[PDB]
Amino acid sequence: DGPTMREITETIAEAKKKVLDVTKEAQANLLTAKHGMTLRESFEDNVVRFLNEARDKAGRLAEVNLKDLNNVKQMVMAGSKGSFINIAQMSACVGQQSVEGKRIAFGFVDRTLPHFSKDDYSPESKGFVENSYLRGLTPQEFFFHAMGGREGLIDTAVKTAETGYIQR
């Protein structure tokens, strides 16, 4: 009803601010590394946790607003298909795309696409999809979501038959 929308948009705008504040920090050379992690590694870690908990709480916000007569919420309650994640990507926020367990890599020199400037580690740049399927993806989010897309397809294709072989 958003209400919920306003709140979700604001929840994400919040995480873009924690991610911005950690960028400024780490660019001043104030971020401390942990033990046995790089700066860059521990930078990425913070950014991925902010982004994840933003997605998470944006999906939660949507699920509470769904009302008893809501058909998806009824399938869910009955247990017949599908899950929190499903509702959340559809209504709240697709969230972070990822190849090889990291955010979208700089496949172009220091950028993920030529629409960005170089050395841009913002969520937008590295494949946080902000929009739900409902609102539809921007072209950048579209591509990064295909990137994440393919990674899953390839892994499905590697068992079929890597498993029909284990079972034998």
Partner: peptide, 8 residues
């Protein structure tokens, strides 16, 4: 396609 340590 969801977030790191979930789906691609």
């Amino acid at each position: 396609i969801w977030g790191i340590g979930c789906n691609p």
